[PDB]
Assembly symmetry: C3
Homo-oligomer: 130 residues x 3
């Protein structure tokens, strides 16, 4: 039983990994809120989804890509000329081997720190085990 769901507390920017440290669910402790990465332990098929809210009132564009190890497996953008709140979200189904790391990487722009509202989220779970 592998499943996790965490939210983003603090604001982020640039090209850094998003540390979702508002952890709500973490069966097996395979997600690390100190690095914001999900480490695969059992080979198999996994679903991941992420929602990243852009910082409002400061900036027009923000990118958030889901990476496996050091390869982009999903890309997303939030854009608005009037600096409005908008979401960079995406979902993936991937096969993972032991040691594989899955995380959400910013690719430019500013993310919102939602404190306790859990605006920016990272969630996932194993569908099938090999």
């Amino acid at each position: 039983k592998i499943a996790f769901y965490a939210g983003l507390k603090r604001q982020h920017e640039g090209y850094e990994v998003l540390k979702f440290d508002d952890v709500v669910t973490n069966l097996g402790n395979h997600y690390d809120p100190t690095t914001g990465k999900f480490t695969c332990s059992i080979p198999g098929i996994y679903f991941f989804t992420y929602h990243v809210l852009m910082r409002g009132g400061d900036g027009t564009s923000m990118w958030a890509d889901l990476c496996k190890n050091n390869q982009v497996r999903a890309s997303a953008i939030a854009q608005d000329a009037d600096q409005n709140y908008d979401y960079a979200s995406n979902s993936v189904v991937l096969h993972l081997e032991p040691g594989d790391e899955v995380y959400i990487k910013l690719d430019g722009g500013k993310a919102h720190g939602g404190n306790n509202n859990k605006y920016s989220t990272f969630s996932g779970f194993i569908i099938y085990a090999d």
Copy 2:
């Protein structure tokens, strides 16, 4: 086998619970389209996801939060200065006990009434039973 998927027919506003009464799937009849809430019967881990379309041509901001019982477990915002259509969407994986209610509540703003087109949606299913 617990799983459901329902859409929103009527427009909503303010801070009311979103009653997705255009029901497509409801294994176990655990979702109530009359209250718009999903009642847990078996303790375990559950996936939920929601997409709420903002009312266009009237208002600039709309909030939609996924609440468990009476606690926010996900927040979302749609915002556009030009009153354009935009989405407040989010997903969660949570542990649930029997009697727990999970639903999508507006937290300010105006929601779009999509009739039968299923623009605004709420779906979910159990991953693991304890």
Copy 3:
């Protein structure tokens, strides 16, 4: 039975055509066809599908992307921005499917973004339960 797929959009789409997600990352069992952009059901049961369609930026203000079962709209989504900014038409569904049923993502007006290999616009899904 392990039934699951996840594909991204390489080329641009527009009008009212089905989105051919031809950047396939996962396709256990080959029930999704990237040449038609359709998921054909073989095993009766309950399936989760989700799609994210990025609107084309700098050209157009509105875009629709609907998830269709057979030839029936089972989910609709819109992306809109007056300043022609990037925005998403995304949605998720849980549906019961019989063998032969086709599930795909169709544009319903507007222009979709071609992300090449970046996987900006995506279509994914998987079986939860088999009958």
